[PDB]
Amino acid sequence: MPEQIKEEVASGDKDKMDKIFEKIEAGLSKLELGDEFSTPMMVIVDPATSLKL
Amino acid sequence: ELIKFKPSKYMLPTPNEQVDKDSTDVAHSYIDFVLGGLLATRKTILQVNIKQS
Amino acid sequence: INNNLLPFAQAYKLASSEIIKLINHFVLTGTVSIQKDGKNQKRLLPNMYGLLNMPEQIKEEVASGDKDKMDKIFEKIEAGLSKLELGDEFSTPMMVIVDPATSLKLVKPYAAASSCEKWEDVLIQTIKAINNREDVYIETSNLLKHKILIYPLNSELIKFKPSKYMLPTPNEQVDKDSTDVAHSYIDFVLGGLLATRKTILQVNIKQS
Amino acid sequence: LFDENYYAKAVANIIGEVKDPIMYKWFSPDQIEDVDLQMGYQKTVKWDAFLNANPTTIANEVNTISTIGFSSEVVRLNYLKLQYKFRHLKQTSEKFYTSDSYIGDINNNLLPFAQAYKLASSEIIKLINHFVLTGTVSIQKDGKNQKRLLPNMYGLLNMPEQIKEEVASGDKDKMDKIFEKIEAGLSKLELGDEFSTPMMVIVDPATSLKLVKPYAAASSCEKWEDVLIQTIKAINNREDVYIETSNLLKHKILIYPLNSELIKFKPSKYMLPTPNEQVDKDSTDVAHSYIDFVLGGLLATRKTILQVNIKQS
Amino acid sequence: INNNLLPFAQAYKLASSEIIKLINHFVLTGTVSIQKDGKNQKRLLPNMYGLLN
Amino acid sequence: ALMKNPQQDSGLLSNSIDFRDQNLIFSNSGGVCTSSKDKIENYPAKGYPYKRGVKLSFGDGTTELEVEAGGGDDLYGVCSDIDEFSGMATVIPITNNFTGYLTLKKDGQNGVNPGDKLNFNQHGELEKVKSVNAIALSKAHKLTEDLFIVLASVFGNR
Amino acid sequence: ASLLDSNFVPINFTEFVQAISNTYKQRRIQFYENLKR
Amino acid sequence: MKNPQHDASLLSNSNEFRDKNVEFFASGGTRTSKFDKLENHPFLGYPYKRGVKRVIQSHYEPHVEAGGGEDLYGICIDIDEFSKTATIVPITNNFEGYLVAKDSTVKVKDKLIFNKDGALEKVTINATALTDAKQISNEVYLVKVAVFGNK
Amino acid sequence: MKNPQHDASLLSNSNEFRDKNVEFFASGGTRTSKFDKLENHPFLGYPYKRGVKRVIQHYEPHVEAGGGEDLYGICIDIDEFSKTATIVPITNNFEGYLVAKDSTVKVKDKLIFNKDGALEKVATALTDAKQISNEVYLVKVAVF
């Protein structure tokens, strides 16, 4: 989907969960939910990310 | 209000009336399906991609 | 509209109308073609003729220099009528078919110019002279072109025995596929005009 | 509303004095229908069929049959909105200009609102009639400096795909040649199954004068007009033929049937002049008013109008 | 749509929403501007301050 | 580009959550700061003179005059809006001052800064400097790879 | 709703314009009725 | 005069709606806007449908008279003989209408300048001719122009 | 586009039944059989009534106007909304009106598809090339 928030974790930081979380936090801050912020959220992750979590 | 899915009522697979029949025992059948129908507001999706280089 | 697709009913109606027009053209002219030039005609079997190409009839030609001389046209018509041979069935109504230009020329006053009489009246009187004061009918057809056709409406001289399936008839075969487009077929039968020799007079006006 | 708007009351009182347009005489009552659209377009869809090739003879094994093709044509009629502005005297200032014989200023050409609106509406109706007749909008006798209109906006004289005949300059005074050209056009006319309908012929004063000469020694009783009427009857199946003379036409003859199936006028319901609510006011005795009107909406079938032009070179 | 013309009610509602957004921004920050960079500020009168300035 | 409104449609819904930097679209017709006492004319349109300087163009004489993109010693006005259905161009005469976003020539657009004098070229595009008083009030904004717009104020002839 | 009816009292300019259009249509109908070709 | 008042004995046939606007009595402009500036000024001579210059000197207020060039001030579009006044559109306001031309040499697409007599003559530039010069009467030529200022 | 009659100014007269098929909107073929192979392919450009060639680039290969050795088939119909084209493979015969390079093409003339997919004289021209638009010529050709 175009015009959405896209973040990229560097190749050398693929094993750094702290760096991944920093990128996720930056994207979350860049999110704009407007007045409809009070709503449930859904996150979909790959098996590798689930293992790292 | 932010993300909506308005799919066709025929999106899921549906058999077709046309069936190919010959003098042999092999027949052919057709299945139709519809694609498309996702709407989302701008800057409401966070996509974090981890480079594997 | 974008794909030029119609329901079966409307498509069949339009196709039937077109086929009926083609059938009428074939009946009148003795030829089958879709070109205004009259070329690329479909090759037909022998003993298949129309009112304009029937053999052993009377053919008269008006010269190009006399294309606008109704006196010369009527002289040729009278010569053809004299050459007509109706035998013992002369006492019968007659039918004439003309093009719109010929009709417009006919509705002119008879000629210094005269009054209380027209070229159509003169033609009717001349035809009555040979048909024994019987009815004379006049029709206008755009299919003709500088042609005048005269023939009696007698079943003992000219007879139309067409097939009972001459008019368009749908076919049981309907082509179907996995898409939304289907196909249908329409059949029609041509042929069946009989005429005795030297009973149809056709006069052609030359242009070149 | 009339208590607060004097101009609306004056328009309502004076609207009855405006004469009917002369274009009504050129169409049958069933040939005119109003459409509710101030500015825009209307779309009509027609279906057609054709034969691609010669028919296929059914003999032996055959499955490659000639096809019949179909087509869909869309006709779009454009409707345009135009406006005029005119000056008049203020309502409260009339008493200072009410002369014994008239009301207004002769020296400055200032008129009361009612008279000014009546004259402006008459002029606009004349312009609308000219546009309906000729297909062009212009204020010059030369016909140049025409207003650039939208496509698919045509009149009875400039409608494309119609029969056009030309009479040479050397034969401009030869009624026989003119009638020969008319005969050629009538023969080329294609009315189809709608032939049983009245016909309308519009001529200029020159043709009207020429039509009364005896037909040609010339015929003692019948005239060229009678011969033309008989010729048109031959093609319309002996129906009524109405002959009209218009000063707008010049060396041109227009023949067309009065059938709604072949030719139809679908003008906007606001085509005729209509006052605007906005009135320009100032500290002086002069005010300004606006009149709106709508143009467009003539539909016709191909090869149903005969236009004969007699060149005056 | 082709000329971006709206009914008076909808136009007034949208304009009022934009003006209220600007008023909230001014109340919070002490400055009036229509740029994300914060430049091209409108000069205001003395003794006119926000919570941030 | 060749249309005031985006010719293609969109697959997304506008957020409509911020109020800053939302007037940069090409469809922003008219002036940013307009007076009710402004004289506005309309003319037949030849080409797409939208957001450009317009000059009078005539024909053989059969049709009325029209306006086409241009400038220099033949400049007549500035086009601010276009009705496509009627093919009409809204013109503000050069005798009436205008302030708004106008097309800038894609040649040295980076050098254009507030306070830089501008003039209309032969194609109706503003270019950095003759006979017309125009002053840039902002910097060039890129809408397409060849489309740049600049806020300018034109206040008559020199 | 036409200007021919004296009892018709318009309320606003939209009603006035509608009455004018109805009056024009009725005038055309009356002219066609009165016309004798 | 703008409106020569003369009594007649028979009515003049006036039914054609074309070629009826090009006349000396037609004041104002072909196209006019509500936001056009008009100024009333005392005049000397008859500067009607001509370029007017402001002449400043018992001392009296400045008046306007036929003229042009570097002294050009406006265009006279209407005149009131009783009050001896003239309505003037200033040079800063664009005007479209029929004005007095020096001769018939003016044609379409011609750039025109107001001469010392307030008449438009072929080539600073002041107007662009829209139509050809038309002789209303005797040596009076009227040409449709669209005034835009001074170059 | 495919149907140039949508931008029409007046209704057409349907009384005549001759000289009515040679038009740009007459899709398909003059003679068609049930056992005919038709393939739908994404297209780029305007390959309507023109010879098409496959171009392989990541997306699937796309058909575009062309001829010569690259000639893959002939496009007989186009769906604009889906941006798809119906193509008869070159291994199947086809009879219909196709775009010609110019009006020099005459009857009994063998033709070759050019770079633009138009037929030009050295696949037999059955009829003469007839002008439709200012730069559009259609010719009935039996391709085999």
Coordinates of C-alpha atoms in Angstrom, one line a residue, chain D residues 46 48-53 63-67 71-76 152 154 160-162 190-192 299-302, chain I residues 3 5-17 20-22 25-27 29-36 97 140:
Chain D
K46 CA -28.3 3.6 -30.5
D48 CA -26.7 -1.0 -35.3
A49 CA -26.0 -4.2 -37.1
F50 CA -24.0 -4.9 -40.3
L51 CA -23.0 -7.9 -42.5
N52 CA -19.3 -8.5 -42.5
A53 CA -19.1 -10.7 -45.6
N63 CA -17.9 -24.6 -39.4
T64 CA -16.4 -21.3 -40.6
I65 CA -19.5 -19.2 -41.1
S66 CA -19.7 -15.5 -42.0
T67 CA -20.3 -13.2 -39.0
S71 CA -22.0 -1.5 -33.1
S72 CA -23.1 1.1 -30.5
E73 CA -23.2 4.8 -31.4
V74 CA -23.5 7.5 -28.8
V75 CA -24.8 11.0 -29.6
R76 CA -23.9 13.8 -27.2
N152 CA -22.0 18.8 -31.4
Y154 CA -25.4 22.4 -35.0
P160 CA -23.3 17.4 -41.1
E161 CA -24.0 14.2 -43.0
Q162 CA -26.9 15.7 -44.9
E190 CA -33.4 8.8 -47.5
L191 CA -36.5 8.8 -45.3
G192 CA -36.9 5.0 -44.9
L299 CA -30.7 16.2 -33.1
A300 CA -31.2 14.7 -36.5
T301 CA -30.6 11.5 -38.4
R302 CA -28.2 11.2 -41.3
Chain I
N3 CA -14.9 2.5 -31.2
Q5 CA -18.4 6.3 -33.1
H6 CA -18.9 7.2 -29.5
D7 CA -18.0 10.8 -30.3
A8 CA -20.9 11.2 -32.8
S9 CA -22.8 14.4 -33.5
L10 CA -26.0 12.9 -35.0
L11 CA -27.9 9.6 -35.3
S12 CA -27.0 7.3 -38.1
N13 CA -29.4 6.0 -40.7
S14 CA -29.8 2.2 -40.6
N15 CA -32.1 1.8 -43.6
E16 CA -29.2 0.9 -45.9
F17 CA -27.6 -2.5 -45.5
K20 CA -21.7 -1.0 -43.6
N21 CA -19.0 -3.4 -42.3
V22 CA -15.7 -1.7 -43.2
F25 CA -15.2 -0.7 -34.6
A26 CA -15.9 -3.9 -36.5
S27 CA -13.9 -6.2 -34.2
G29 CA -13.2 -11.6 -38.1
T30 CA -15.4 -11.7 -41.1
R31 CA -15.5 -15.5 -41.0
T32 CA -15.0 -17.3 -37.7
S33 CA -15.0 -20.9 -36.6
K34 CA -15.8 -22.5 -33.3
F35 CA -12.4 -24.4 -33.3
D36 CA -10.3 -21.2 -33.2
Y97 CA -9.7 -6.2 -41.9
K140 CA -9.2 -7.4 -45.9

